[PDB]
Design a protein around this ligand. Structure first.
Ligand SMILES: [Cl-]
Length: 400
């Protein structure tokens, strides 16, 4: 039987144009002052169906509600929330449904406050953010690729990363060369700032790095030119380093990660970034992790959106030419990548998670942006063992 689908704006709506002219909060749409602003609400339907749309809203205004080219003009004239009819739409196929809101006239300060989109008489199952963190829900599902290492002990992992222009999205972490105890990648942080980040967790489990015993603190061994070193907390704790570097979409950068136990019960982690635009390797940092005796484990990559406001945009990244070097000095081309998604995806509140093969023998990750094809947890992807073995001046790297 058809059912009512109540879609909360706080977990499913975004200001998608003129960001300063409306806001999504725990209340839904508030501070909606600019007629140029567009608010978009997304929910997924499993089968074709009609839907009678209403808004749970209040205000003194005229707004425009749209589903593709079909638009409805809607007056709000109330001080308190009421269920305001919009009109019927026909969803002709499964997938994400995007409903847009735009201000047309405001009798006072703003276009009104919108708490929910209500879709009545809907046939079939739906997915969207409900009974789930709006914050994490809107940030969307992070995705991961894990690469299989050969047998034996790997000391270095090498991976080539390219963020295509279509995948370049502010407030994203493109994590290239992770390992069992931390991360190495690049971020697009603001219009004037992009960072190469390298983080290593302490073995001591705490949310405050100052609560880590001295003999378990991550120690700085080497620091690259212009690199900033500090400590982090609130997601476990440890040491981090970054280099401000204006990386460009469409360019291929190289991440070279060294993990080497010292034989004295510590392991050293040394991160090198190839600044393609300058054609030179940079040292980010070398950190020592105490109470740890490991070679390289769990080489992996991930794609993450930091900003709930950016959830409506996709982001994407390509990873190519994965190599591992054994402690004995032997290079092997890696071929096997396993795709996983985060718990937001597992909750099925966001279905816009994807990864796999490119047509040019790379792997990709893609999330956000409310696209319609997902990929199951644990799906294995493969590449041909082609590509140029890395030619690294090891001595020169040691002088950085
Ligand atoms: Cl108002």
């Amino acid at each position: 039987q058809p059912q009512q689908v109540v879609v909360g704006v706080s977990g499913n709506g975004y200001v998608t144009r003129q960001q300063d002219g409306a806001r999504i909060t725990q209340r839904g749409v508030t501070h909606w002052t600019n007629p140029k602003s567009i608010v978009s609400i997304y929910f997924y339907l499993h089968q074709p169906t009609t839907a009678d749309l209403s808004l749970y809203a209040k205000g003194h205004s005229e707004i425009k509600v749209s589903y593709g080219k079909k638009g409805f003009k809607v007056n709000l004239q109330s001080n308190d929330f009421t269920k305001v009819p919009v009109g019927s739409i026909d969803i002709r196929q499964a997938g994400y449904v995007r409903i847009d809101l735009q201000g047309v006239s405001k009798s006072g300060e703003g276009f009104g406050e919108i708490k929910q989109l209500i879709a009545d008489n809907v046939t079939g199952k739906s997915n969207y953010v409900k009974d789930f963190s709006d914050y994490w829900g809107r940030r969307g599902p992070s995705v991961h690729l894990g690469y299989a290492l050969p047998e034996g002990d790997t000391e270095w992992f090498y991976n080539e990363i390219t963020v295509p222009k279509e995948g370049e999205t502010m407030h994203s972490y493109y994590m290239a060369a992770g390992f069992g105890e931390g991360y190495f990648g690049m971020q697009y942080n603001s219009p004037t700032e992009r960072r190469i980040l390298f983080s290593v967790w302490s073995p001591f489990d705490t949310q405050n790095p100052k609560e880590i015993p001295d003999d378990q603190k991550i120690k700085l061994l080497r620091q690259g030119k212009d690199v900033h070193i500090g400590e982090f907390g609130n997601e476990g704790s440890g040491g981090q380093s970054y280099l401000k570097y204006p990386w460009k979409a469409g360019n291929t950068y190289k991440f070279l990660m060294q993990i080497r136990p010292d034989g004295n019960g510590n392991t050293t982690y040394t991160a090198y970034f190839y600044a393609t635009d300058e054609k030179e390797w940079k040292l980010i940092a070398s950190f020592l992790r105490p109470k740890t005796n490991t070679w390289y484990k769990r080489p992996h990559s991930f794609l993450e959106n930091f900003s709930p406001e950016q959830g409506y945009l996709s982001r994407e990244v390509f990873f190519g030419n994965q190599w591992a070097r054994s402690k004995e000095g032997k290079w092997s081309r890696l071929t096997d990548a396993t795709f996983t998604h985060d718990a937001t995806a597992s909750a099925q509140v966001r279905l816009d998670y994807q990864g796999g093969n490119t047509k040019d023998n790379r792997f990709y990750l893609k999330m956000g942006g409310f696209f319609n094809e997902s990929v199951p947890m644990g799906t294995k992807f493969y590449c041909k063992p082609t590509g140029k073995e890395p030619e690294i001046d090891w001595e020169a790297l040691k002088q950085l």
